[PDB]
């Protein structure tokens, strides 16, 4: 209690509200005569019509402080606008009861309920986790998806977004993952299984009302709404606000995981919308573009979002981040998927060609990756054949795709017997292993058995990746 | 005729599936990626040039207005 | 992303590859209808062999 | 002294800075945020803060230290986690029990409380001691058993007092010198500016291999102790895995893993794996964490500290080179250094060169990379060390036309290009053989002739086979497998065998995580023998189609040769490889009758 | 009030504009040119002029209007042709008697001379009234029987005086409120900013289909009242059929046509054919102009007008949705609006994103499209409207890689994919089923199960039949008809019948001008029954060629099923469809003997 | 265009406006734009000339109250012979159709070297009819286009499958293309052909084909014009 006792919250602080507006340009408002501006203070703008919108200082120079306005600068008048300086950077009221609440991208509740009855005003975009205090995520979470369990395994605390495009069922896959996420070997602390559930935190940035309603309804159907906190920033919401929305979501995820010890599963949908917000802000500020008009600091800011994951030494919580980003034209080379792939420990690639073939989920195995899969699988966790089977599946899938491409030019007859085996493997693979029901939950062992059944197409001698010790144990009826 | 038709159909399928389907991505890369990035860098450099020129001329105009006032 | 020529991206090379693409496309169509004629004659000859 | 006048990202402009100089460490704000001056305009000096800049106010003091960014060099570097400013992360977490990096924290870089056992060197009182002289040795680790306490460079004099053998902390005086009347004191540690490379007697030519354990890297594109290596590839190619495998299994006597702007889970990984892995190099089974020090800067950690991270890491590498230790530097991603420079320049307003990068990026890269080569360490006793800079490059979009890759290519001697397509097939380490190269192959003939005389010949043979099969493969995918000579089919099948069983290296399995050079040479010999004997048998009457089936056992045997345990010893592995070669010889002799 | 400084085309730096707000419309010069403030710098306001600026002096007044770009909402909006700035083109023509549009013309958007009959609502004096509350209805046209008078949003208070039943103009005061002592006068119209969406109590899920009357649209790719639809706005493709069907036969109680940036002679067609489009939904033949407003912008109209045209149209549509009327908005070419955005961004100098398009193009498109949708209108009484956007994208010659087209296809849930070739073959309405799609199929399951339960199953079966024929035509062309099984011939014949009968709708006839959803469902049952009976009979050993030569009479009956006149009555047409189904079942039973 | 507006809309004349070298005007426009320190847009051309080209082009068309009309025929030189260039692209945005002058036809000595396969008049159908030229104008134009395209394809196959392997329509199409390009398209620089003379020359070219596969001409017109 004494740790909680020390607050210094009762110290009231009067605020300097300035009528000294000088200029407005794009989303930026300039104020003169500011007395000791802080670099990143939040300000409140009382517009002439009486409305109050939220601002943030992006640059200070002596007596002037450049302010960006989250809700846009339309209607701002130099004569009437009044700017009150909060004195501190952006903070959000957080508490455990704030789970089950729906919020805007600025933290304002929109569930027709009360405001957040805070336990602490956590600073936004919190400081990076000490690399010494981190714990390497090696606890597999069984997502029930064979394309993501046997291959592309996720462990608790891993950053792993869903690479997709507009129209593909990325958000259905995300809903399924949040629906059936669970440890492969659960703690089994109690038969109740109350602490075994994931405390989802969902952030929506620039998503249409249909997707927000879909996610809300899907959380409702599974009883997950009592455990999930939503931060909705729809298409009609202000674009500058899309920057702070994932910051709010990750701040509450950090509070829940590293302070209340909850296994948080953070979902950040349409990271490409956040990227577009960043690009709009940068083009407004005339900063140097990195690639395709995106800011040079895109990698650093995206990492600041993504790196707020993993689990820490003395704390029994974790933040498993599963963003969703819309690849603009199915291009990995685009900056949004490129930097994300550079930061986020792997990616689950949703494929348009697979989707057109009617396969659900359309997870393209080859472009997908899971960096910390290597330590989440093996003898003590999952099964001793997991790594070799996954590698052989990757190899045979690649060979099958290459052989199909060869058949596309030289006909099926010219294919070697290995090529025909590879087409057989690819067909059965895509249509019976990747293909999975939207509500079907396959344990990693069932998916491993299906993978072995697929691999038994080839005779034992051509399964070169699989080590002989494993191959002489699992190839014959396991 | 079977031999000739097999060779011709193989060549046509190759052109449809590999030759054209690689030339089109190569052209798409060239123009859409690299020419756009070069034009974008020229835009940024010339805009920075304009910003420097305008700030210099604005400072000169401010100095002239000040000495007119004085 | 996809097969690539790995070529020097310039306006000269862009025009070169546009001409190459047009030539390859017209050659593909050209050989396609050549093969249509050849396979028509091939089906005819197969009927002659059959009877 | 000075006061903040402007804050805009990591860049802070401080006024009343009339007495400050370029690249001078300055303490910013009431938290004493560390930064250095990168510009002066009259009394206003631009500062790139090395910590989080949020919350700085105008008017708060900006103290100027007068010294450049200096890294402490002494006992305690090894087995330690550091940030860009060489703040010990373990000590940060212990002193501030929070799990975060508190801004403005000022932990001493090297522990001042550990009592190091000091054995005085060959120098006695009255001797003339110069920069780089070993005036004592200190038991740091059981692996680094003699951490030799060098005299600081740029300092010389006559020994006045030398501490006898005993236990001394880093703040206790050890050596006392007299240059020309001024009497100076020296301790276990000494600071060095991270931007001026440490002096050496002479840069020798690097001619001993940096055996990294990867079959493709050791065989086709070898690096040398003292070489510069670039590993550019898209995300997921596996450059950090190659870097980590090098750090674990190279023949280096020290490793400086610099996580320049990369994910912190990699640092957690190395911190949790290195104490679990051991080397016999010191003469006893001892953990590699005793041999590795880190400079950690996660991608969300401050941007300018990313630039500082490479420099502190390379100065640590130079310091351990000055002790006669073959130290290898791994920069986890130098492209992150380049993006840090680009962000700082964009804040500054400098005109970009290409893709937004500053016009001086190539100069900085060249100056950093030139600090690598094998050299005779300064002072006496005479000794030789090396600094193998193995820096991974992360080009945007995976395109090697990226300015960082283009600049680095003209600087490094080794280019381990990574192929995204090969990585997607999980064909790691996914070296793009068709573009990758090494300019140290000619230098290493001296080593090969002494150790593995046929190694360069078989390396060239395999490169010829791979190139021939690559052109064959493009021809086939244009026209089909028909009309290929049986020799052409043998080339294609042998190169497929190579790509699937020799260039392949699982990196996490017991049998082939580390492939020692003798095993790599034996596998090279076995694969070349298989190719040559198939070619000869088919040329001498036999046909490849039924020969492949009639001799599938030998193909499976060379496939399984990668499953040989390196722990069986060189004798056992070589004996079993010779057995394999003899069995292949007799099988191909009998099958072609 | 203000003055003028630097003028470079439309950018006009003002003076003494201390009280101007951002994005506030001002009157520039003595001609009162319209323009919006783009920047504020002290007393200087950067104004972009909404039209030609050739004659402007330095110092002549600039009067600030006090409001952003806003549209006058009220009666008289029906049957009026506007530009993006909602300038009444007709009223401009008669007022000026001029071929052109005079510069600085300021005719009111809504006619102030027309006297409208006003019937007051339930609200009395002293009642508290809120935004969106209907306090009266005005008989606008015969199609719009009651243009309900909404209290403007953001305005509320106690009703102090309300005009009795009578006939009024727009300038005359109609209702009076007091909020907190302050007294407000409300008239028959009000102005709402175009760039802020009109608020609603709740945005409902659009789930009632938008019956366009076209069989292909209503069956295979159904849109929804409050849905979103994208169209390729090419020339040869019969998009005029789609626009005329939505404006002539759809469920919409109002139609907003937005001809943004169209050609000069294309807007001539749009403005000349619409006056003679007539409807029977009212029970009497009346022009659709009584229900439709046109926003007409030739490419020479000012860039601001072209950019704001879609916002003006969507604001009018939102205004008519807030009255409870299902309104459909048709955008002539959103690519022209994106070109207007690119010009605006270039003239403001904003850095581009994708070959010149600004960084916010996707954000602007998403925000604009989100304004569509079914919603419960603000205020009382409870009512529900819907805005359906049917926007056509016309990039550079089918270059659908345009970021405008990419964003539109990523936002819109329905793509009707008109094809040039299908128009060449005179296969109207020329919908390319292969590329067209609709993502509202799942939502309309409620409506189907409520009314036509088998509709989704038949739609999916028709999709499968057409897709199978599409993928089997290549094997036909490559191999010959002889290689086809009997069931494949069944699929081909049934699919050809579908293409010639169901997808192809004459439209210009009397039996195919409007195919209702129930007649469409009956035709789907007929076609699917034909396919199923043929498949079953042939699976019972029957040779398909004999049946095709034998069952041509039932095929002809199915062919003439599209000739059934919908005006004959739902019961009569359903009975004759039942007779058709009975006859086809009987004849298949006979012929399968 | 001011003179054309005056004449057509005040004197009530029918005015044709030929704006030759629109590309040179675009170069001048770019020079003027860069004179005002504006940063160039795509391909160095300023980003706002779609507006200026629109102001130039839209000063045309016929109007309600005036019997006069303005018809514009802009003439622009494609730099490096591509449509993707900003000037032809924007002109295609703003204008109805385009006429193509082909270098390949020019090198063959054909004048005018108008390549009719790519050239299109979007609203041609409004200029042709019974009281507008002749009742056969539209279908004769369609048939000419179809047979010319078939002739070009058959000329492609002439060097690939041989002359004798072509179908009878292709053998007719080679000589139709010959007569077409060098008698009908090939018109003297001072040869004034009225629309009816050009139409009956087109008919004389179309009289070589048989009834069965003149399929894009209406059977009424075909049976009234082709058979005598
Ligand atoms: N040699 C290898 N052996 C086995 N797995 C590898 C190897 N190289 C890479 N991988 C797998 O692929 C992933 C590559 O990620 P990483 O090394 O971080 O590449 P990058 O740094 O280019 O993103 C690793 O997490 C690892 O799981």
PDB file of N, CA and C in Angstrom, chain F residues 16-26 53 56-57 71-79 87-88 91 95 97-101 111-112 114:
ATOM      1  N   UNK F  16     -14.374  26.352 -86.709  1.00  0.00           N
ATOM      2  CA  UNK F  16     -13.419  25.291 -86.442  1.00  0.00           C
ATOM      3  C   UNK F  16     -12.116  25.900 -85.950  1.00  0.00           C
ATOM      4  N   UNK F  17     -11.588  25.353 -84.861  1.00  0.00           N
ATOM      5  CA  UNK F  17     -10.386  25.882 -84.225  1.00  0.00           C
ATOM      6  C   UNK F  17      -9.300  24.820 -84.275  1.00  0.00           C
ATOM      7  N   UNK F  18      -8.213  25.109 -84.981  1.00  0.00           N
ATOM      8  CA  UNK F  18      -7.062  24.218 -85.048  1.00  0.00           C
ATOM      9  C   UNK F  18      -5.959  24.826 -84.195  1.00  0.00           C
ATOM     10  N   UNK F  19      -5.626  24.157 -83.093  1.00  0.00           N
ATOM     11  CA  UNK F  19      -4.580  24.608 -82.182  1.00  0.00           C
ATOM     12  C   UNK F  19      -3.358  23.718 -82.388  1.00  0.00           C
ATOM     13  N   UNK F  20      -2.539  24.082 -83.370  1.00  0.00           N
ATOM     14  CA  UNK F  20      -1.406  23.239 -83.715  1.00  0.00           C
ATOM     15  C   UNK F  20      -0.255  23.449 -82.737  1.00  0.00           C
ATOM     16  N   UNK F  21       0.508  22.377 -82.519  1.00  0.00           N
ATOM     17  CA  UNK F  21       1.642  22.361 -81.596  1.00  0.00           C
ATOM     18  C   UNK F  21       1.202  22.713 -80.173  1.00  0.00           C
ATOM     19  N   UNK F  22       0.294  21.891 -79.642  1.00  0.00           N
ATOM     20  CA  UNK F  22      -0.090  22.028 -78.242  1.00  0.00           C
ATOM     21  C   UNK F  22       1.062  21.670 -77.314  1.00  0.00           C
ATOM     22  N   UNK F  23       1.977  20.812 -77.768  1.00  0.00           N
ATOM     23  CA  UNK F  23       3.141  20.473 -76.956  1.00  0.00           C
ATOM     24  C   UNK F  23       4.068  21.670 -76.791  1.00  0.00           C
ATOM     25  N   UNK F  24       4.216  22.483 -77.837  1.00  0.00           N
ATOM     26  CA  UNK F  24       5.005  23.701 -77.707  1.00  0.00           C
ATOM     27  C   UNK F  24       4.350  24.669 -76.732  1.00  0.00           C
ATOM     28  N   UNK F  25       3.020  24.756 -76.765  1.00  0.00           N
ATOM     29  CA  UNK F  25       2.311  25.550 -75.771  1.00  0.00           C
ATOM     30  C   UNK F  25       2.556  25.016 -74.369  1.00  0.00           C
ATOM     31  N   UNK F  26       2.607  23.693 -74.218  1.00  0.00           N
ATOM     32  CA  UNK F  26       2.865  23.106 -72.908  1.00  0.00           C
ATOM     33  C   UNK F  26       4.272  23.436 -72.426  1.00  0.00           C
ATOM     34  N   UNK F  53      -5.240  23.369 -69.775  1.00  0.00           N
ATOM     35  CA  UNK F  53      -5.677  22.677 -70.978  1.00  0.00           C
ATOM     36  C   UNK F  53      -7.190  22.534 -71.003  1.00  0.00           C
ATOM     37  N   UNK F  56      -8.620  25.836 -72.088  1.00  0.00           N
ATOM     38  CA  UNK F  56      -8.468  25.989 -73.532  1.00  0.00           C
ATOM     39  C   UNK F  56      -9.481  25.129 -74.278  1.00  0.00           C
ATOM     40  N   UNK F  57      -9.602  23.858 -73.893  1.00  0.00           N
ATOM     41  CA  UNK F  57     -10.410  22.924 -74.669  1.00  0.00           C
ATOM     42  C   UNK F  57     -11.901  23.187 -74.502  1.00  0.00           C
ATOM     43  N   UNK F  71     -15.829  23.994 -82.910  1.00  0.00           N
ATOM     44  CA  UNK F  71     -15.199  22.687 -82.984  1.00  0.00           C
ATOM     45  C   UNK F  71     -13.696  22.882 -82.898  1.00  0.00           C
ATOM     46  N   UNK F  72     -13.048  22.146 -82.005  1.00  0.00           N
ATOM     47  CA  UNK F  72     -11.613  22.265 -81.815  1.00  0.00           C
ATOM     48  C   UNK F  72     -10.897  21.019 -82.303  1.00  0.00           C
ATOM     49  N   UNK F  73      -9.780  21.233 -82.986  1.00  0.00           N
ATOM     50  CA  UNK F  73      -8.890  20.150 -83.383  1.00  0.00           C
ATOM     51  C   UNK F  73      -7.501  20.509 -82.874  1.00  0.00           C
ATOM     52  N   UNK F  74      -7.207  20.279 -81.599  1.00  0.00           N
ATOM     53  CA  UNK F  74      -5.840  20.482 -81.119  1.00  0.00           C
ATOM     54  C   UNK F  74      -4.889  19.528 -81.817  1.00  0.00           C
ATOM     55  N   UNK F  75      -3.665  19.991 -82.032  1.00  0.00           N
ATOM     56  CA  UNK F  75      -2.628  19.165 -82.630  1.00  0.00           C
ATOM     57  C   UNK F  75      -1.403  19.240 -81.740  1.00  0.00           C
ATOM     58  N   UNK F  76      -1.009  18.101 -81.188  1.00  0.00           N
ATOM     59  CA  UNK F  76       0.102  18.028 -80.258  1.00  0.00           C
ATOM     60  C   UNK F  76       1.075  16.961 -80.727  1.00  0.00           C
ATOM     61  N   UNK F  77       2.360  17.256 -80.603  1.00  0.00           N
ATOM     62  CA  UNK F  77       3.404  16.304 -80.940  1.00  0.00           C
ATOM     63  C   UNK F  77       3.757  15.510 -79.692  1.00  0.00           C
ATOM     64  N   UNK F  78       3.550  14.204 -79.743  1.00  0.00           N
ATOM     65  CA  UNK F  78       3.929  13.354 -78.625  1.00  0.00           C
ATOM     66  C   UNK F  78       5.445  13.305 -78.534  1.00  0.00           C
ATOM     67  N   UNK F  79       6.049  13.745 -77.432  1.00  0.00           N
ATOM     68  CA  UNK F  79       7.507  13.642 -77.303  1.00  0.00           C
ATOM     69  C   UNK F  79       7.907  12.201 -77.021  1.00  0.00           C
ATOM     70  N   UNK F  87       1.138  15.502 -71.626  1.00  0.00           N
ATOM     71  CA  UNK F  87       0.356  16.321 -72.551  1.00  0.00           C
ATOM     72  C   UNK F  87      -0.696  15.470 -73.263  1.00  0.00           C
ATOM     73  N   UNK F  88      -0.337  14.380 -73.958  1.00  0.00           N
ATOM     74  CA  UNK F  88      -1.393  13.556 -74.569  1.00  0.00           C
ATOM     75  C   UNK F  88      -2.332  12.939 -73.554  1.00  0.00           C
ATOM     76  N   UNK F  91      -4.770  15.688 -72.550  1.00  0.00           N
ATOM     77  CA  UNK F  91      -5.636  15.982 -73.685  1.00  0.00           C
ATOM     78  C   UNK F  91      -6.660  14.873 -73.892  1.00  0.00           C
ATOM     79  N   UNK F  95     -10.506  15.874 -73.934  1.00  0.00           N
ATOM     80  CA  UNK F  95     -11.059  15.929 -75.277  1.00  0.00           C
ATOM     81  C   UNK F  95     -11.735  14.615 -75.649  1.00  0.00           C
ATOM     82  N   UNK F  97     -11.959  11.778 -77.912  1.00  0.00           N
ATOM     83  CA  UNK F  97     -11.290  11.002 -78.930  1.00  0.00           C
ATOM     84  C   UNK F  97      -9.922  11.549 -79.265  1.00  0.00           C
ATOM     85  N   UNK F  98      -9.366  11.035 -80.362  1.00  0.00           N
ATOM     86  CA  UNK F  98      -8.089  11.520 -80.862  1.00  0.00           C
ATOM     87  C   UNK F  98      -7.849  10.972 -82.260  1.00  0.00           C
ATOM     88  N   UNK F  99      -7.150  11.752 -83.073  1.00  0.00           N
ATOM     89  CA  UNK F  99      -6.658  11.288 -84.363  1.00  0.00           C
ATOM     90  C   UNK F  99      -5.170  10.999 -84.242  1.00  0.00           C
ATOM     91  N   UNK F 100      -4.746   9.865 -84.782  1.00  0.00           N
ATOM     92  CA  UNK F 100      -3.364   9.428 -84.684  1.00  0.00           C
ATOM     93  C   UNK F 100      -2.670   9.591 -86.026  1.00  0.00           C
ATOM     94  N   UNK F 101      -1.491  10.203 -86.002  1.00  0.00           N
ATOM     95  CA  UNK F 101      -0.597  10.260 -87.150  1.00  0.00           C
ATOM     96  C   UNK F 101       0.561   9.316 -86.869  1.00  0.00           C
ATOM     97  N   UNK F 111       0.211   9.593 -97.299  1.00  0.00           N
ATOM     98  CA  UNK F 111      -0.243  10.874 -96.782  1.00  0.00           C
ATOM     99  C   UNK F 111      -1.745  10.990 -97.008  1.00  0.00           C
ATOM    100  N   UNK F 112      -2.528  11.335 -95.978  1.00  0.00           N
ATOM    101  CA  UNK F 112      -2.027  11.533 -94.617  1.00  0.00           C
ATOM    102  C   UNK F 112      -1.748  10.219 -93.906  1.00  0.00           C
ATOM    103  N   UNK F 114      -2.464   8.812 -91.304  1.00  0.00           N
ATOM    104  CA  UNK F 114      -3.380   8.665 -90.180  1.00  0.00           C
ATOM    105  C   UNK F 114      -3.597   7.183 -89.914  1.00  0.00           C
TER     106      UNK F 114
END
